[PDB]
Design a protein around this ligand. Structure first.
Ligand code: MG
Ligand code: MG
Ligand code: NA
Ligand code: NA
Ligand code: NA
Ligand code: NA
Lengths: 1011, 420
């Protein structure tokens, strides 16, 4: 029997699914959520042994511990212990597609544990074992005797162990299979691992027990009165003395309580459920749950004899909230939600897919700190504790079934097969059975990338039957099929249609209004954050705010799925697809997060935070209008801090108490500002500061900001008259200017500033030259590879046209002696195979105060693929410790991703000017820069720049960040114009036209001086 | 408010309307033409496609392919091998749908739809032709004067502008070449505003109160320098209103031994002034030529937010077609995306917008009825590196879209002025 190769067999001897149990025997412990003596953990040191296949496991391992076995920590993924490789593959299955068959070589984990059971647990009641998650299929033995079998990697499997255990020492043996027929339904874009990766536990329940319970809360039109409806199932012996009391607690107060015997309403010709009871509790003015305000009550479910003896108690957190679609909108408590969401896999760089409380909390606090209100469980039910934390901290959760069949052809081959309905149902139904009582969960999802099959319709309807209180969503088969209450596309663009056959991705704006369509639109996945990305994010949020039925979306995704490996020296590095000898693989496509694997923020997270603000600001005169995008809470923990600065120099600051009702406005008059006589640009900056700390934030947390240009006074005053005059020298192969200790050299063969001097110290290591290329971002590369080119990708369009091997031919290099200046004039052409790609024209005018004014004018062929940049690069000799700039900052900011950035005077160590993306590329650019300081050097103008110890050549030649070695001196890329980064997706050109360098003619000017 | 004058003469707007309302849409990939019929009922049984490829105005190859497109359907026309010329310039494809037979409503050979793509472009690498002549600089107390052969340029050291030009003993200018940041207000510029009831939101009023119109150019810098084979004039001005600096023009004039005056303008615009209507220069010429011949978007009047209709090519028109007779006189006759403009002996090269006529902006803004307009001495020429949008969504509130406002803060352009 090969149950792992049979989709008609997804379990044996497995107990029904149900919400979380603890079997409290004290009701007060149930109320407070204190640990239960009846809930034991079996986590800890276990014995493990790896085999190539289940045929290779010896018969003796059932009765006796294997001598070769090692002691390992459980929960764990055996790949993280290095028993075999983890495989990163996206769409293409890690195994041959041949359902229901798996390879004969099927890596096999043999876990075992010897553990102690107290005698009392066997004298009465039932003792079950709980495996919160085993990947992907297992058989269980206890004391040599076979217990059962189980599949579904991401939901718990429980087994009654009563008849198997003896008082004292018992032995579990778990044979875990890496591949099974269940694998075909677990094809998510992530690392492919295996083991007992979630918690293991023992649970004692009495013979007479609570077997299930459902909490539903329905409301009146204005939410002044609620009814909590608790439905309770029992197992065991039914007698007339049996009662159930459900009581509802606001902290330490009991607001309501109901008591009833068993025997529900009549439901058909045959009677009622003798073993069931429903209790209704009236709750006047109930405190409402939301992400803004996670008000929670406690429901204690007491099974007892009518004369007072408690049999057991179960409990849950209850959040009074109503989810409904009405008139095309998703409403929470009668108000239109705006989903500031993200997709979060369960990933840890060290522990693999094992989740722990600390990680979970770090994540939640980070999400809330960055203006997220919602999370999608991509693409499986999570560790049960995740839902508890979301209930309490306040996040909207999309709970998603563990079904992804992306690798099939066509994508719905299994989901449209009635032979896979049994398998798929288990995965939907057991999720809902487990999680339906969590207030945080607001939407059910049928799975991920599995086409649209009839099994999706059947299962869609099943949920709507069992739980009318949540909407159902599912993206497969075009985002708007009959198996979804929500239009939930992935990577639909804001304005640009993408008219694929069968499954188009319409512009989200356009999607809402298609004939006969009325559903709300919330993107299940958008703004793919792979490497240097999130360009065009403000575009989305402009739309979300403008269109009522565009109700936001979930960013893809939260945390890079990178793993730590060690080298010869034993030093850690970040690893991705292929780095474990795993092949075939999909390389760095496993790292698409707003944060690194160690939860260090990418720069992109700040653009998310800014656009997802709950406060909007308008300015008119010296009057600021603040609008609250909150639906429920007043801005109680909010004050506004405003400052005025002239080119970085502050001139007036101050704070005003914010008292803005939800969806209301407040007007704030500025004090008459002192207008400066000094020349430059006035800038207003406001910040919302939270003075009080919270569960999720520290004191003085900044939640929102915004900038305006105020009055601008232009510099009329001419530069002071320098009495000196630069001396020009003309040799055959050099133009040499001289003033004081300052000295410039121009090479007559190449046409570039070849060297510079202050004193007799060199300033340059490579000459100052033009640059029209960048180290390709993940967005520029897409799905293109050395062996399988994608000619569409930005990197490949560049390569082919010859941008990277453009050879600079000289057309002119002359010198001229002005009244009080020396004027070098240069012109270049960059060509590839007869075709002139670009043309550069430059004047360098060095005056009497040592200042050199570079004027650049580039022509770009209209038929050449647009350039990544138009600017100048050189290798500075100076290795300074600090970078000081008047510009947009403080963090890396780009043309299509700079809304969060603020204009001011910025100062940072040189290491902060480099963003350590695991796959090296162009990074660290600052835009909107009027002035740049680095040691002796200063550049003025209006430019974009990046300053690092890594050349664009190295960053383009290096696969991993840890393989980057610092070069001599400091590479400097000053750009007059830079292309967008994009990232609507990362498999097709995503940079929007207005951020492309398509003007054909470009002009910028720098002044290089010494201070 | 019409697309035609009361006599049924088309306004320039009617061509933009015609072009956008076309019943055929086109896509180009490689050298295939994808034709999509937006008809719902008829086939294209009275339709033909004329295609032609031009290098900066010179036709290289033309051809006409028959159209058989069903309603809502597509046709794929594979073009023949187009000739890639060595010559430097911009290749353009132009396609036209032509109705070969007369209908109850149209003449035979009626044009129903058109579209242009840039094809290949070859950038000029080869050097300018050799010049051994060298312009001679004269420096008087209050004039900079350049001289080459019979050509004489005169820069006023007091005002800062090119004050006069001579070809032989002939005056070329009737006013000095100055900067212009204003335009004669259009109807979309005035809105509901009146001199008796001011609407402060209207563009014209924003410009007025900011002093855009009465701005005095106060010179900051006017130096001159001699190079190996050129004279470099370098100027800098600031248009101020009541202590407030609104614009700053910084120019460089480079006359060389071939006869051509290269102009480089860099303008700063204050962020807290209303965005300027234009950024270019104006002069009253002396010559009155008969024909305007330009390489750029044409032939009819076109603006940055109204120019899909216009095609790039070589257009030659009588001077009077370069003026649009709106009953209420305003800024008009502009042609966008120009690389060359020819007027009498003059020629301007580069990349700009232009309008040319006998009517000063000052007169057009002071004249309420087109019949009251008197033709002035010489020819007023407006050359803008940049011109604001014209709007139209409505005419009682500002309707110029963000992308067609001149908000950038810093603008640059370059112009070659020669004789032929
Ligand atoms: Mg099976
Ligand atoms: Mg997938
Ligand atoms: Na919305
Ligand atoms: Na991915
Ligand atoms: Na790289
Ligand atoms: Na035809």
């Amino acid at each position: 029997r090969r149950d792992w190769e049979n989709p008609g067999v997804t379990q044996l001897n497995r107990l029904a699914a149900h919400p979380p149990f603890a079997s409290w025997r004290n009701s007060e412990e149930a109320r407070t959520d204190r640990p239960s003596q009846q809930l034991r953990s079996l986590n800890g040191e276990w014995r493990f042994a790896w085999f190539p296949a289940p045929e290779a496991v010896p018969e003796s391992w059932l009765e006796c511990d294997l001598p070769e076995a090692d002691t390992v920590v459980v929960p764990s993924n055996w790949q993280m212990h290095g028993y075999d490789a983890p495989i990163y593959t996206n769409v293409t299955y890690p195994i041959t597609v041949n359902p229901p068959f798996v390879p004969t070589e099927n890596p096999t984990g043999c876990y075992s544990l010897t553990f102690n059971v107290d005698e009392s647990w066997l004298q009465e009641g039932q003792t079950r074992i709980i495996f919160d998650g085993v990947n992907s299929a297992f058989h269980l033995w206890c004391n040599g005797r076979w217990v059962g079998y189980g599949q579904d990697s991401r939901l718990p499997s429980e087994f009654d162990l009563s008849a198997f255990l003896r008082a004292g020492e018992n032995r579990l043996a778990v044979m875990v299979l890496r591949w099974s027929d269940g694998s075909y339904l677990e094809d998510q874009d992530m690392w492919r691992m295996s083991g007992i990766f979630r918690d293991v536990s023992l649970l004692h329940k009495p013979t007479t027990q609570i077997s299930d319970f459902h909490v539903a809360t329905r409301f009146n039109d204005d939410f002044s009165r609620a009814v909590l409806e608790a439905e309770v199932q029992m197992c065991g012996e039914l007698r007339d003395y049996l009662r159930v009391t459900v009581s509802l607690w606001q902290g330490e107060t009991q607001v309501a309580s109901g008591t009833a015997p068993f025997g529900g309403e009549i439901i058909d010709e045959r009677g009622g459920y003798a073993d069931r009871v429903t209790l209704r509790l009236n709750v006047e003015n109930p405190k409402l749950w939301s992400a803004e305000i996670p008000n929670l009550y406690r429901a204690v479910v007491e099974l007892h004899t009518a004369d007072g003896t408690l049999i057991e108690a179960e409990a849950c957190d209850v959040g009074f909230r109503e989810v409904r679609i009405e008139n095309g909108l998703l409403l929470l408590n009668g108000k239109p939600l705006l989903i500031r969401g993200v997709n979060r896999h369960e990933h840890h760089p060290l522990h693999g897919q094992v989740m722990d409380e600390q990680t979970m909390v770090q994540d939640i606090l980070l999400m809330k700190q960055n203006n997220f209100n919602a999370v999608r469980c991509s693409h499986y039910p999570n560790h049960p504790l995740w839902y508890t934390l979301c209930d309490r901290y306040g996040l909207y959760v999309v709970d998603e079934a563990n079904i992804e069949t992306h690798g099939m052809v066509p994508m719905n081959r299994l989901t449209d097969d009635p032979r896979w309905l049994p398998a798929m149902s288990e995965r939907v139904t057991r999720m809902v059975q487990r999680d339906r009582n969590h207030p945080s969960v607001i939407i059910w999802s049928l799975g991920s990338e599995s086409g649209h099959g009839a099994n999706h319709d059947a299962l869609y309807r099943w949920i709507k039957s069992v739980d009318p209180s949540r909407p159902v969503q599912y993206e497969g088969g075009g985002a708007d099929t009959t198996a979804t209450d929500i239009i939930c596309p992935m990577y639909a663009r804001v304005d640009e249609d993408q008219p694929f056959p069968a499954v188009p991705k319409w512009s989200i704006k356009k999607w809402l209004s298609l004939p006969g369509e009325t559903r709300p639109l919330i993107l299940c996945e958008y703004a793919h954050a792979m490497g240097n990305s999130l360009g065009g994010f403000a575009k989305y949020w402009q739309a979300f705010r403008q269109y009522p039925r565009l109700q936001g979306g979930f960013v893809w995704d939260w945390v890079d799925q990178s793993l730590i490996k060690y080298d010869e020296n034993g030093n850690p590095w970040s690893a991705y697809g292929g780095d474990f000898g795993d092949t075939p693989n999909d390389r760095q496509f496993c790292m698409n997060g707003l944060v690194f694997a160690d939860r260090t923020p990418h720069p992109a997270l700040t653009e998310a935070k800014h656009q997802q603000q709950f406060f909007q600001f308008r300015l008119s005169g010296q009057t600021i209008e603040v609008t609250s995008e909150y639906l429920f809470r007043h801005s109680d923990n909010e004050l506004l801090h405003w400052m005025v600065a002239l080119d970085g120099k502050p001139l007036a600051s101050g704070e005003v108490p914010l008292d803005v009702a939800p969806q209301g406005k407040q007007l704030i008059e500025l004090p008459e500002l002192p207008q400066p006589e000094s020349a430059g640009q006035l800038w207003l900056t406001v910040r919302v500061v939270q003075p009080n700390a919270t569960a999720w934030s520290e004191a003085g947390h900044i939640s929102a900001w915004q900038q305006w240009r105020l009055a601008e006074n232009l510099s009329v005053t001419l530069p002071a008259a320098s009495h000196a005059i630069p001396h020009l020298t003309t040799s055959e192969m050099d133009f040499c200017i001289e003033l004081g200790n300052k000295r410039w050299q121009f090479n007559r063969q190449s046409g570039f500033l070849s060297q510079m001097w202050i004193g007799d110290k060199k300033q340059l290591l490579t000459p100052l030259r033009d640059q029209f290329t960048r180290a390709p971002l993940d967005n520029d590369i897409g799905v293109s590879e050395a062996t399988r080119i994608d000619p569409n990708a930005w990197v490949e369009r560049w390569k082919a046209a010859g941008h990277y091997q453009a050879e600079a031919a000289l057309l002119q290099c002359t010198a001229d002696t002005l009244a009080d200046a020396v004027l070098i004039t240069t012109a270049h052409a960059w060509q590839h195979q007869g075709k002139t790609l670009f043309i550069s024209r430059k004047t360098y005018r060095i005056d009497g105060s040592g200042q050199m004014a570079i004027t650049v004018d580039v022509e770009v062929a209209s038929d050449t693929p647009h350039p990544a940049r138009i600017g100048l690069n050189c290798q500075l000799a100076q290795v300074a410790e600090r970078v000081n700039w008047l510009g947009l900052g403080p963090q890396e900011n780009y043309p299509d991703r700079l809304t969060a950035a603020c204009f001011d005077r910025w100062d940072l160590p040189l290491s902060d000017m480099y963003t350590p993306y695991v796959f090296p590329s162009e990074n660290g650019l600052r835009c909107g820069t009027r002035e740049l300081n680095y040691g002796p050097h200063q550049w003025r103008g209006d430019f974009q720049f990046n300053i690092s110890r890594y050349s664009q050549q190295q960053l383009m030649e290096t696969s991993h960040r840890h393989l980057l070695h610092a070069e001599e001196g400091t590479w400097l890329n000053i750009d007059g114009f830079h292309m967008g980064i994009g990232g609507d997706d990362s498999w097709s050109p995503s940079v929007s036209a207005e951020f492309q360098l398509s003007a054909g003619r470009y002009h910028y000017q720098l002044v290089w001086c010494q201070k």
